Design a protein around this ligand. Sequence first.
Ligand SMILES: CNC(=O)[C@@H](C)N(Cc1ccccc1OC(F)F)C(=O)c1cnc(C(=O)n2cc3ccc(C(N)=O)cc3c2)[nH]1
Length: 295
Amino acid sequence: GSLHMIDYKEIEVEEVVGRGAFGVVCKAKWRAKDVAIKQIESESERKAFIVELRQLSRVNHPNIVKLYGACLNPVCLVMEYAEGGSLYNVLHGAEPLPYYTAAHAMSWCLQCSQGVAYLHSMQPKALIHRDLKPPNLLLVAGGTVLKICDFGTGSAAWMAPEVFEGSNYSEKCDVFSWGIILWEVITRRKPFDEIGGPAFRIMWAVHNGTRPPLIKNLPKPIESLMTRCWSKDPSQRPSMEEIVKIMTHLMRYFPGADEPLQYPCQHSLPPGEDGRVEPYVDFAEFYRLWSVDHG
Ligand SMILES: CNC(=O)[C@@H](C)N(Cc1ccccc1OC(F)F)C(=O)c1cnc(C(=O)n2cc3ccc(C(N)=O)cc3c2)[nH]1
């Protein structure tokens, strides 16, 4: 797919905004436009840089971050910038944390599934993301629109066990990750936070069948989707197209996802811990609206 070759001298490197999975990203100007630039830090990131460049130049989707072009001297990517923050910072970041609703949580997950289903529908082979997690997901438009980032592939908590068992694996690994993320936005908890120590400890746990705890009062239609997504056996996980369909159906019972995040929350996570956790979000309205349709 098309890319602007860009001359490094016609862009103005502003403020660093954060590190990606690899590289470093800065706000900047290019033809007086808001733009993010990503540059490699060390030489070990040049491979990731080429993968990302090749992969991102092929994709165009409203839930995937736009690539405008590149600069081959020095090596840098030029992307869309918008006001917002990572899903990680929205969920777990610095005070003050925003209030959000069940509708936001479900919409964020629908939007990620839409971008990933596009990736998995690529011809001749699926583009597998391989690193879906909230630090690689950006919220824009007042926290209502989700964009997938970091296509260059601390990620053990979201990794399907077949990937870190070094088996062969498919696009179903992304479905496992999406499932963990669904759990995370609903509970507002870090998956496997309690399992201390280095990463091999998470790997061991998940490899042996450990999953995040069940959620109190979670509707069965959502629970069923979530738990299928994190099936040990990848063939029992739904495809992303099926996820998109199911989440689209469910959204008719979650009005208000277009509301901006505007209110602060004092989020004290209540220790549930008897093998079940409370949702951060509230499902009473879902149940009310569902009963209106289904007796
Ligand atoms: C509260 N502060 C934050 O959450 C920081 C970490 N953040 C998001 C952000 C910045 C750099 C790298 C990663 C990142 O997290 C996530 F968005 F990928 C931003 O502030 C921010 C605001 N607007 C953006 C943005 O437009 N972009 C555009 C990006 C394009 C690609 C990548 C990437 N990692 O490949 C990050 C990008 C971040 N980022």
